[PDB]
Amino acid sequence: ANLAAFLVLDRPEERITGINDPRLRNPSDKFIYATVKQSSVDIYFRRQVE
């Protein structure tokens, strides 16, 4: 039972699904992420409004 409880759920943090991950919807200081600079990634972020 202990081994099954250990191996059923992976202790490592789940991988990011993509641009619609739950943590991306409500950013928090516990999970900080940013692009480099005002480059095309910043332009895409500004163009997106959702």
């Binding site: 039972a1 739950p22 919807r25 409500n26 959702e50």
Partner: protein, 32 residues
Amino acid sequence: TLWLTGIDIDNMAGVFYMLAAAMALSLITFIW
């Protein structure tokens, strides 16, 4: 979709059961 979204204990019972069975068998031996 856009808004409004986002996101043992039986071991003691078993050991008590086996202890009770052992006690019942001991009582049977004593009365025999």
